[PDB]
């Protein structure tokens, strides 16, 4: 019986997972995998908000989008370098 | 040509290639139609009233409220 609202996942690296020997405590391994997936999805939905900002900067500005959206474009392309499970550019998370 | 009434009284050929029933009668249903129609009704009811009423639990909704919160706090 879930309670009405958004899911609640605690935001903290599970203690016990030491990257020297990942296959030492199995319980922390799955928790760490889920956590890493969660921050990767956070960094994806953070890069999509910047895409929305760029999209509505290209439309509101118009012809002057080359100077009024320069800050947004470089921010978006900087947050798109390490999106996630994509091109060979894989972040060291 | 756009005034004359048509010649075809009823559409050519019977629907689903079935002889229409006896006068003052009805198309007697087969042994599968009712158990299949109640199932094709409950399916639509469950999907429409169930998928549109289940909570919006997801990883694209939880993260769109966790990135929208930290993208603000950086300022």
């Amino acid at each position: 019986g879930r309670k009405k609202g958004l899911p609640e996942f605690e935001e903290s690296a599970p203690d016990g997972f030491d990257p020297e020997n990942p296959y030492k405590d199995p319980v922390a391994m799955v928790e760490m995998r889920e956590h890493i997936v969660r921050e990767k999805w956070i960094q994806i939905e953070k890069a999509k908000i910047l895409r929305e900002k760029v999209k509505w900067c290209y439309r509101v500005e118009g012809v002057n989008h080359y100077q009024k959206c320069r800050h947004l474009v470089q921010q978006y392309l900087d947050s798109t370098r390490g999106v996630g499970w994509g091109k060979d550019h894989r972040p060291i998370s | 040509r756009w005034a004359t009434p048509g010649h075809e009284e009823r559409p050519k050929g019977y629907f689903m290639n079935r002889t229409p029933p006896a006068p003052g009668q009805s198309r007697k249903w087969e042994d599968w139609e009712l158990p299949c129609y109640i199932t094709s009704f409950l399916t639509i009811v469950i999907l429409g009233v169930g998928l549109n009423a289940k909570p919006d639990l997801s990883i694209e909704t939880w993260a769109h409220q966790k990135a929208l919160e930290r993208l603000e706090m950086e300022k």
Binding site: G1, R2, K3 | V49, G50, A53, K54, P55
Partner: peptide, 15 residues
């Protein structure tokens, strides 16, 4: 009163 409320409070109970 309206079906959506009961459906929501039933799906939440099932989950």
């Amino acid at each position: 009163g309206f079906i959506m409320e009961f459906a929501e409070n039933l799906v939440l109970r099932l989950m």
